[PDB]
Amino acid sequence: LSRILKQLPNLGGSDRKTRAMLLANAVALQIPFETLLDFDEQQDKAVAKFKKILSKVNENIAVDTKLAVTYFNNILRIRQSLITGITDPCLVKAVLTSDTANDYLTVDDVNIVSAVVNGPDYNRIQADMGNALNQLIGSID
Amino acid sequence: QQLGFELSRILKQLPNLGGSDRKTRAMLLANAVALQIPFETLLDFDEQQDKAVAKFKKILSKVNENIAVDTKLAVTYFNNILRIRQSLITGITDPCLVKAVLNDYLTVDDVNIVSAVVNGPDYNRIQADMGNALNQLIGSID
Amino acid sequence: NPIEGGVVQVLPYIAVMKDVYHEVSGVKMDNEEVNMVEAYRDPSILDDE
Amino acid sequence: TDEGPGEVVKALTVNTNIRNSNNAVKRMLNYLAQLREVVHNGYNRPKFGIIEGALSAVMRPTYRYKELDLEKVIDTIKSKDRWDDVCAAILNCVKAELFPAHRDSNIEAAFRVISGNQDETPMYLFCSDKEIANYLMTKGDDRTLGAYLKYDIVSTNNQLFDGKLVVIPTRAVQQENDILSWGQFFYVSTVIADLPITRGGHQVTREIAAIPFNLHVNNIPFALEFKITGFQKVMGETQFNGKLADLKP
Amino acid sequence: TDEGPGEVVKALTVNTNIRNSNNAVKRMLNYLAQLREVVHNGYNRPKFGIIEGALSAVMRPTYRYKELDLEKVIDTIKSKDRWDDVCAAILNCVKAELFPAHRDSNIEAAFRVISGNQDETPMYLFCSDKEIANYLMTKGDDRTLGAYLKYDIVSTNNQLFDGKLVVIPTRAVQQENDILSWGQFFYVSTVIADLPITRG
Amino acid sequence: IEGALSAVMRPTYRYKELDLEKVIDTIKSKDRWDDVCAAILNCVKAELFPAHRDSNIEAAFRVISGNQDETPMYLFCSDKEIANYLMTKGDDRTLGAYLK
Amino acid sequence: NYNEKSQRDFRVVTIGYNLAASRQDEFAERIYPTTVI
Amino acid sequence: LDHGYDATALLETTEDIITGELDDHLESLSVE
Amino acid sequence: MFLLPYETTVCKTLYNPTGGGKLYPKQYVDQIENAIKKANVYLPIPPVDARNGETLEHSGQITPVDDFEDIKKFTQIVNIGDRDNPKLVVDARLYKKIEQRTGIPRIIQQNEWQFQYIRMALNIKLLREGPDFLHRLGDIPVKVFYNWISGILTQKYSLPPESTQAIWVICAVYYFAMQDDDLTEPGQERDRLIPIISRLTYIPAGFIADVIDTLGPLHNAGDLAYEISTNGRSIRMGKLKFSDLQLLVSPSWFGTASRENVGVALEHMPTYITLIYMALADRSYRKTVLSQKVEMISRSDDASRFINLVNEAVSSQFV
Amino acid sequence: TQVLVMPKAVFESYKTAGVQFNKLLDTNYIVSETSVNDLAEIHQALTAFPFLLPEKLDIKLAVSPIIKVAELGEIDGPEQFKMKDLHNRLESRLATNELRDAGNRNLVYDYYLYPVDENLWVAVQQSAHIASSDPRRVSIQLNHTFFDSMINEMLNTRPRESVASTQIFTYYLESC
Amino acid sequence: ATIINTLKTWFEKLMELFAKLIRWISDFKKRDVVVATRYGKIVRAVDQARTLFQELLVKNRLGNRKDALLEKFDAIAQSIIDDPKILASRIYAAAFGSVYYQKEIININNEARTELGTMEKLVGTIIEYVDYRALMPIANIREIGKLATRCNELSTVYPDRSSIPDFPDKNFWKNSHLLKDRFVAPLDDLLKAYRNSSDALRKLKQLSRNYSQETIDAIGESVQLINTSLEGMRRITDTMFEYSQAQYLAASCVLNYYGKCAQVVSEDYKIHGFNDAIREWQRRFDKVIDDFKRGYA
Amino acid sequence: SIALIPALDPAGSNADFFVDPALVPPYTIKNEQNLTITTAPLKANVRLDLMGNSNANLLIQRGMLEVSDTIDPAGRLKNLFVLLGGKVVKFKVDRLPRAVFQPDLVGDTRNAVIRFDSDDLVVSGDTTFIDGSADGVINDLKTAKLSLRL
Amino acid sequence: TTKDLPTDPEPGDTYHVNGVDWIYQEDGGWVTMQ
Structure with a gap:
């Protein structure tokens, strides 16, 4: 536990904040959200288990447990939006140009995503398609 | 306003260069639709992919009545973007997404830069060590 | 729409005309009307002495 | 034969789509001929009824025609610069003829007042x-002419453009049913119907037919037409050192 | 009608404003013709009454008319460089006549004394x-002549500039009623008046 | 001629003898490598683009694919x-506006 | 009325039209700067 | 028509154009 | 006050050709009402969905199924219940297509369906709880109304500022007349509106009081058209009837039954409020005349509050 | 030949995108046309391939791309350090997958054979089936059409008498 | 009258535009403070590391291994310059060493700092109204449009880097000296100008009085000019901010290049026979890395 | 093939609808088959059955046309033939805004009215007559450097 | 200060400013010698 925690470089006063993010991801990776339920029963169970896991932070070095819960709850809500579907260019950009997206895309595919996403008018065009689809996606049999 | 015409009208507004236009045109359709289509709760990924692609191809059939799109390339992009979306809902959520949606200021680049200079583990390797060093705890409890 | 079967383009503008009386012979009113837009390229259409 | 018209509709749909493309080319080139006659004659002011196009009443009709024989245009020294020398020769010819046409037509006033x-x-x-x-783009051009005007590039394989370049203005951002587009295509859903026509009173065959129902309209009475030839002679042969080699006694 | 036109009455101001611009062009071109005649004739020293302009009695009047046929001015070897070479040919010709005209005229001394x-x-x-x-506006990074003189580019679409480039000095920083401007536009508020005239 | 597509596109063949002594024109020797490489590639472009247009190959490909x-x-x-001469520098897989 | 093909109910579009001028043009203003009398 | 064939009413109002440009600019900020 | 769209002047005109005007289209609503009640016997009318998969209390929809064949394709919401617990039904066959594989209807246009069930949710709240929430939705609905109606009239007829101000006062009073039945007739209750209208329009009380003193009844859109022509200090409009207002407002929206929905909005409050909600909660409805007037006068902070207040009015009717 | 096991998701990408299947054994090509996750999943799919190939007939199981990348990162050249960076990304992504799909545990996959030349036997890893009791026998019965596909192809070059002595031939007989 | 409502509506819209921009620029300032603190540490480390290699190579202290190590160094640079995080836009091309693009970006920054004064004057003109028509600074408005236009051209990301001429290749560390002078966006000037503009308009809430048509026309032109100026400056600011971020990445990339190169020297002479100069050099380089790490910590 | 081309009866039965051949000789149009019809411009100031005298009847059989045959409202005035000094000049006006068929507002709903009013028909030195000549009025216009706007 | 270099120089040119030597390589443009 502490062996790997000591691998994180010290950065200002954020030592208690980056590890809070790392822990929130470490738990959220292995507690899935069952698509069958909505965001109340499966959400409360995932959060309850996370808070129970925080009971062992005495073995850790620098974990801000109040922020770690904040990060964990943000992960679940972000997953809810992704399940339902996202169009907001401010979040679509964040997904398309990300550490996960660079592992599923090839080098050439990323170069293309970086050409569209970083266009001077991307946010406007992406928003317009979001409405064009949100209003009419159901028309497609 | 048929969806094929509205999407085509919007795509016409992308800047043009030359033949590279079909790669960026296809990518944008893949991005918008792969992320916009809602997932059905009763399906697993295998079935959700088959259903989402069936609709995506039907959308291209309507778009290709107005603006030319390479069908095979657009599907290639669609499947890649859809898999990313599926991974995020079942898998690890990037901290840039928690940061983007939610006092969050110091970013990942900031620690990956230091790790690169000292030639040590980066954020993603540390994240992998975290979960691994946590595997036993989560599996043991419920 | 098939029911429409055509379009109409309506072009409003402000015309610069000439102060002209109607003559008795009156084949037509010799009123040199020009679109005000033309004044941007050839302002002489506005000259008035 | 008892079959659905599905494949037949696809065959007729493509045929109709080709006709619509060819009609746009014929309409464009025929409209340029209309500009040639009107601009040839004494029409240098906006006026209703001279030529089709809603903007002919706010801007001056303009038409310029130039022939480019690249063997008489290009100045080149090195082989590795030959591509850029060909590209620049064509773009510089367009600038030389387009700058006075952009000024003379008063197109900016029409666009600004309408928009x-x-x-x-x-x-x-x-x-x-x-x-x-393939010769109009040059990497560092930024699709930008002299001071501020930008250009886009499209190409056709139509025989009627075998060696033509035509420069036409459009609105930088296109709106639905926008008047400031150089032309406009008014499309109504194509009608396809299947009737067991007994044509002639003797033969019998079911005739599945597609009836196009659309119109191409021009709005802006402005074009520059270039005839560009000689690509193979200026690129496929030595230009600088070969001419020096011909000075040998 | 009590109040019919709301936007059409605005064309009365636009009509006035465009005419004011056109009057500036006629005054400029007519002044240049008058200056050409004075400088063409034996008037290379300050004097009063020969031409309009408060400074005509402190600086030598100067006018240089040059006809530039680019074929006889440009020299290039490549085609991708021709844009730069023709743009420089025009600017270099301006410098060729501007510097000796700046030296031969006394405008710099007049500015130093007056300001x-x-x-x-x-x-x-x-x-x-x-x-x-289109050719002079090569880039905003330059806008500088040889040592210390700077320039700016102002364009018009007026019909009376079919093929003219005219270079005129002004004060680098323009002030109200500043005599050192090449010219001045003396404006009095334009009155828009209404009355039911029974004309005829 | 042999070829399943001989009935969908126009047969096209262009033969050019690129005798470099009659094609290359340069002034400095340090550019000779680029001038030789460019002379070959530029001659291909000069004869390729009209063959691409006149053969109607693009239409045949679009219909079949x-x-x-x-x-x-x-x-x-x-x-x-x-x-060897073909530089292939980085990508430089581009013939012009739209072909690789 | 075997063929009632539309003749009258056309889609009509109003073309914009708005003129402006900033006192005398910037060309005239830089050459003849305005002084208010 | 939309409003009417009177050529005076067909003319677009300058104040409405200014408001429209303000609304379009603010809409873009909301999207971005 | 109008409770159901079919009580409004526009529906009376469209669905009651004989004696059209001030006469309820009984022969049309009762026919489609009976068809729904009879269909409920063999196949119960399913509830109306809303937001995140929730249903509306005392609601139903006619789904695109074979059983619902005797019901005519009506547009406006039909009440098949009583006054105390009315069950509102909307025809979904114009909005949803039946899926041939599973059998679940799918929405063709989301904003058109979203419009339908928000209007119903606000109408159910009105029918059951009364016109209480309509007075606390903020200053946007009233500012939009008189700017929207006066804006079209001012541009069309080249009206002077004085006539535009008179129309603002007339429309502002009419809007309130549709919220409180005591404001539909001349009297001291109309005068109580002067402080409010001046605050909204920034028009001096003297001008406002002079206009109100001359106003007659304001029970429907026909009365609105009359007062606009009568006490609007302009003769260029002529003598407007409700049929003239319908022609002025019809091009202010788009979609299924877009001309009826806007005309109904002139009298039916839940419909008008829903249109503004869609104008602020959508981007597709950005090119319309109504949406421009909503965004023109709506500030960012006030628009957010408006949406939140409507969302509570809608969600409070969820099962 | 050499069997290269890849998930259906990766195979369909190759076919849809149009990636030359011939050059998927050349490390320098597959890394350019393959995402980091796809490369990691190919490794995972190789390590989940239960069957022993007929080594006696020179039929080998492909070395996973991660190993090939790791080896090139230690060999002097103009791309060595870029290949080292790729290796690190593969290890982190592989560990991320292993921590997520560890729950898979007791199941076996259907495989589909897509022959590519004589030097590459693409084996597509398709739908999973749950198998806890005697998963070896369940895997054999499920992959009937995989076993006969392998037999059909190796009989094109190998002698029939030699193929008949392989475990792959036996598995076919055991299935049916 | 309706004029008062028209003026008040415009004023609210302008203040709302500033309110949105001020929040965005504050976020930029908060991020820039974090970046500026880290950027100082990076540049110091790069300057120290560059000196150490200059001494290492110029004295030929590597011996026969010089050539082999240099080849490895090139390989390191090639692996960094091709990092997908480095966009193909001219903004990043400038950040990574290109000179022509950097000069244009700097010139744009310097000009924006002066056009902001024009924006304040436009708002002040509205205060002078609420015939007195100001001559209006439409001039600088032409320039801000051109600057925003060029900013969009610079920030555009092409599908492939080959579309940018003279894009930085593996030799991006050779021009690291250009990173010494940190590029700073005019974020403080923007906040001052926007907050003063918003407050000035806030003080116009009470309008009163019927205005002449010539006053309303003059106000209308001022409002239109301000709207255009705000959109133009937004485009410019975003592009100038992007370069600040790009320069931070470029400085980090050069430091990573030097760090990895030092690691190869250490490993190469641990496998082979090390000299004393090599161990001394590495200890000096380790000190530079330690100071860098302590600065971040 | 769907064009409504006024067709001249070789027997002259409808010759009074067409311009005297002495001024504008007729010209021949063929369809994809070997069927050939003779076409001439219609005489100005004429009343006729426009469909009945079209090539549709004289192409195959005189009585093919029935009430099912209707005219497309989207028609245009294609050419005008103007007589000048005994010779004829052909003016192409097909695409002009005044050549478009308009609905007749008063009367049957299937009536189309053409109202072509143009002050800008150019006759100049570069003009030729229908037969290609440029003699007479045009020649004098050429040598005087004049043009007429008819 | 070290961006005072001539615009549009020839390939292979060398130019010295503020103790910094710049080669104008054809590919990378202006790059320091070392």
Whole structure:
């Protein structure tokens, strides 16, 4: 536990904040959200288990447990939006140009995503398609 | 306003260069639709992919009545973007997404830069060590 | 729409005309009307002495 | 034969789509001929009824025709610069003829007054075949002419553009049913019907037919037409040192 | 009708404003013709009454008319360089006549005396149509002549500039009622008046 | 002629003898490598673009493949003395506006 | 009325039209700067 | 028509154009 | 006050050709009402969905199924219940297509369906709880109304500022007349509106009081058209009837039954409020005349509050 | 030949995108046309391939791309350090997958054979089936059409008498 | 009258535009403070590391291994310059060493700092109204449009880097000296100008009085000019901010290049026979890395 | 093939609808088959059955046309033939805004009215007559450097 | 200060400013010698 925690470089006063993010991801990776339920029963169970896991932070070095819960709850809500579907260019950009997206895309595919996403008018065009689809996606049999 | 015409009208507004236009045109359709289509709760990924692609191809059939799109390339992009979306809902959520949606200021680049200079583990390797060093705890409890 | 079967383009503008009386012979009113837009390229259409 | 018309509709749909494309080419080139006659005659002021196009009443009709024989245009020294020398020769010819046409037509005033944006200018479209277009882009051009005008590039494989480049202005950002587009295509759903026609009173065959129902309209009475030839002679042969070799006694 | 036109009455102001611009062009071109005649004749020293202009009695009147046929001016070897070479050909010709005209005229001394600023020099304006401005506006990074003189480019679409480039000095920083401007526009508020005239 | 597509596109063949002593024109020797490479590539472009247009190959490919914007990708078939010259710098897989 | 093909109910579009001028043009203003009398 | 064939009413109002430009600019900020 | 769209002047005109005007289209609503009640016997009318998969209390929809064949394709919401617990039904066959594989209807246009069930949710709240929430939705609905109606009239008829101000006062009073039945007739209750209208329009009380003193009844859109022509200090409009207002407002929206929905909005409050909600909660409805007037006068902070207040009015009717 | 196991998701990408299947054994090509996750999943799919190939007939199981990348990162050249960076990304992504799909545990996959030349036997890893009791026998019965596909192809070059002695031939007989 | 409502509506819209921009620029300032603190540490480390290699190579202290190590160094640079995080836009091309693009970006920054004064004057003109028509600074408005236009051209990301001429290749560390002078966006000037503009308009809430048509026309032109100026400056600011971020990445990339190169020297002479100069050099380089790490910590 | 081309009866039965051949000789149009019809411009100031005298009847059989045959409202005035000094000049006006068929507002709903009013028909030195000549009025216009706007 | 270099120089040119030597390589443009 502490062996790997000591691998994180010290950065200002954020030592208690980056590890809070790392822990929130470490738990959220292995507690899935069952698509069958909505965001109340499966959400409360995932959060309850996370808070129970925080009971062992005495073995850790620098974990801000109040922020770690904040990060964990943000992960679940972000997953809810992704399940339902996202169009907001401010979040679509964040997904398309990300550490996960660079592992599923090839080098050439990323170069293309970086050409569209970083266009001077991307946010406007992406928003317009979001409405064009949100209003009419159901028309497609 | 048929969806094929509205999407085509919007795509016409992308800047043009030359033949590279079909790669960026296809990518944008893949991005918008792969992320916009809602997932059905009763399906697993295998079935959700088959259903989402069936609709995506039907959308291209309507778009290709107005603006030319390479069908095979657009599907290639669609499947890649859809898999990313599926991974995020079942898998690890990037901290840039928690940061983007939610006092969050110091970013990942900031620690990956230091790790690169000292030639040590980066954020993603540390994240992998975290979960691994946590595997036993989560599996043991419920 | 098939029911429409055509379009109409309506072009409003402000015309610069000439102060002209109607003559008795009156084949037509010799009123040199020009679109005000033309004044941007050839302002002489506005000259008035 | 008892079958659905599905494949037949696809065959007729493509045929109709080709006709619509060819009609646009014929309409464009025929309209240029209309500009040639009107601009040839004494019509240098906006007036209703001279030529089709809603903007002929606000801007001056303009038409310029130039022939480019590249063996008499290009100045080149090195082989590795030969591509850029060909590209620049064509673009510089367009600038030389387009700058006075952009000024003379008063197109900026028409666009600004119609759009309501006093800082808006047209963005030109370079319409050529699939050979000339390959020479109009030069990496560091930024699709930008002398001071501020921008251009786009499209190409056709139509025989009627075998060696033509035509420069026409359009609105930089296109709106639905926008008047400031150089032309406009008014499309109504194509009608396809299947009747067991007994044509002639003797033969019998079911005739599945597609009836196009659309119109191509021109709005802006402005074009520059270039005839560009000689690509193979200026690129496929030595130009500088070969001419020096011919000075030998 | 009580109040019919709301936007049409605005055309009365636009009509006035465009005419004011056109009057500036006629005054400029007619002044240049008058200056050409004075400088063409034996008037190379300050004098009163020969031409309009408060400074005509402190500086030598100067006018240089040059006809530039680019074929006889440009020299290039490549085609991708021709844009730069033709743009420089025009600017180099302006410098060729501008520097000796600046030296031969006394405008710099006149500015130094009139403004009271011993570090002030005139700034030249390149007055041209759209066709020529396209060539002069090579980049905003330059806008500088040889050592210390600067210039700016102002374009018009007026019909009377079919093929003219005219370079005129102004004060680098323009002030109210500043005599050192090449010219002045003396404006009095334009009155818009209404009355039911029973004309005829 | 042999070829399933001889009935969908026009047969096209262009033969050019690139005798470099009559094609290359340069002034400095340090540019000779680029001038030789460019002279070959530019001659190919000069004869390729009109063959692409006049052969109607793009239309044939689009109909058969079913894509409205698919074009052939051309192959430079040569020995190991000439293939060396083709710089291939980085990508530089581009013939012009739309072909690789 | 075997063929009632539309003749009258056309889609009509109003073309914009708005003129402006900033006192005398910037060309005239830079050459003849305005002084208010 | 939309409003009417009177050529005076067909003319777009300058004040409405200014408001429209303000609304379009603010809409873009909301999207971005 | 109008409770159901079919009580409004526009529906009376469209669905009651004989004696059209001030006469309820009984022969049309009762026919489609009976068809729904009879269909409920063999196949119960399913509830109306809303937001995140929730249903509306005392609601139903006619789904695109074979059983619902005797019901005519009506557009406006039909009440098949009583006054105390009315069950509102909307025809979904114009909005949803039946899926041939599973059998679940799918929405063709989301904003058109979203419009339908928000209007119903606000109408159910009105029918059951009364016109209480309509007075606390903010100053946007009233500012939009008189700017929207006066804006079209001012541009069309080249009206002077004085006539535009008179129309603002007339429309502002009419809007309130549709919220409180005591404001539909002349009297001291109309005068109580002067402080409010001045605050909204920034028009001096003297001008406002002079206009109100001359106003007659304001029970429907026909009365609105009359007062606009009568006490609007302009003769260029002529003598407007409700049929003239319908022609002025019809091009202010788009979609299924877009001309009826806007005309109904002139009298039916839940419909008008829903249109503004869609104008602020959508981007597709950005090119319309109504949406421009909503965004023109709506500030960012006030628009957010408006949406939140409507969302509570809608969600409070969820099962 | 050499069997290269890849998930259906990766195979369909190759076929849809149009990636030359011939050059998927050349590390320098597959890394350019393959995402980091796809490369990691190919490794995972190789390590989940239960069957022993007929080594006696020179039929080998492909070395996973991660190993090939790791080896090139230690060999002097102009791309060595870029290949080292790729290796690190593969290890982190592989560990991320292993921590997520560890729950898979007791199941077996259907495989589909897509022959590519004589030097590459693409084996597509398709739908999973749950198998806890005697998963070896369940895997054999499920992959009937995989076993006969392998037999059909190796009989094109190998002698029939030699193929008949392989475990792959036996598995076919055991299935049916 | 309706004029008062028209003026008040415009004023609210302008203040709302500033309110949105001020929040965005504050976020930029908060991020820039974090970046500026880290950027100082990076540049110091790069300057120290560059000196150490200059001494290492110029004295030929590597011996026969010089050539082999240099080849490895090139390989390191090639692996960094091709990092997908480095966009193909000219903004990043400038950040990574290109000179022509950097000069244009700097010139744009310097000009924006002066056009902001024009924006304040436009708002002040509205205060002077609420015939007195100001001559209006439409001039600088032409320039801000051109600057925003060029900013969009610079920030555009092409599908492939080959579309940018003279894009930085593996030799991006050779021009690291250009990173010494940190590029700073005019974020403080923007906040001052926007907050003063918003407050000035806030003080116009009470309008009163019927205005002449010539006053309303003059106000209308001022409002239109301000709207255009705000959109133009937004485009410029975003592009100038992007370069600040790009320069931070470029400085980090050069430092990573030097760090990895030092690691190869250490490993190469641990496998082979090390000299004393090599161990001394590495200890000096380790000190530079330690100071860098302590600065971040 | 769907064009409504006024056709001249070789027997002259409808010759009074067409311009005297002495001024504008007729010209021949063929369809994809070997069927050939003779076409001439219609005489100005004429009343006729426009469909009945079209090539549709004289192409195959005189009585093919029935009430099912209707005219497309989207028609245009294609050419005008103007007589000048005994010779005829052909003016192409097909695409002009005044050549478009308009609905007749008063009367049957299937009536189309053409109202072509143009002050800008150019006759100049570069003009030729229908037969290609440029003699007479045009020649004098050429040598005087004049043009007429008819 | 070290961006005072001539615009549009020839390939292979060398130019010295503020103790910094710049080669104008054809590919990378202006790059320091070392």
